[PDB]
Amino acid sequence: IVSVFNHPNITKITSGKWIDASTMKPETAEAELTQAIETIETITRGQHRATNI
């Protein structure tokens, strides 16, 4: 039984840390979320769209 985190055909994105040494990076968080949404829109060529985070 394979977990959702261990499937070998789901998109994976290595990310810089949103919190480092007790400070926040909302700019990086926003950029990475937008990149993930654009990726989900792009890979399926407009057939599917993200709904939940």
């Binding site: 829109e41 792009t42 060529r45 407009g46």
Partner: protein, 156 residues
């Protein structure tokens, strides 16, 4: 907040596929013996019956002479190991003339009109030992992890 549109391209080849509608010829009065045949590989003739008229074919082996290429058929083939094959003791469709897509083990584009050389398991290879008279038709495509080539065949 703007719309978008995307573009995707269909693949153009498959193993054992008939390339086009030029002058072709299909031998369907054969039977496979001693094993199974992969769709898109050369075959050899063991013996031909004198009275009944059926030919006996098998996969290409060392030192033999190829006779044709197995072709796709949604009805006569069996689905096994995630591919179309011809099981033993069943009718088979050999193709003896025309343009066909064949599996390849090469890595570079071939020269149009050159001689086709096959490897010891009935798959095209740039440096094979088994020699034929068939030619390359120019096409050179790649499906998902599969390398295919256009080969033109004439009657033995």
């Amino acid at each position: 907040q703007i719309n978008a549109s995307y573009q995707r391209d269909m693949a153009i080849a498959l193993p054992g596929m008939v390339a086009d509608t030029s002058k072709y010829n299909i031998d369907g009065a054969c039977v496979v013996n001693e094993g199974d045949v992969l769709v898109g590989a050369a075959v050899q003739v063991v013996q031909a019956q004198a009275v009944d008229g059926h030919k006996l074919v098998k996969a290409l082996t060392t030192g033999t002479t190829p006779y044709g290429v197995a072709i796709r058929s949604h009805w006569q083939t069996v689905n096994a190991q995630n591919q179309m094959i011809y099981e033993d003791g069943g009718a088979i469709n050999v193709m003896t003339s025309g343009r066909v897509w064949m599996l390849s083990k090469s890595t570079e584009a071939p020269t149009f009109g050159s001689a086709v050389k096959l490897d010891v398991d009935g798959q095209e290879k740039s440096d094979g030992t088994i020699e034929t008279t068939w030619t390359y038709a120019g096409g050179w495509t790649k499906y998902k992890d599969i390398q295919l080539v256009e080969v033109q065949l004439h009657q033995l």
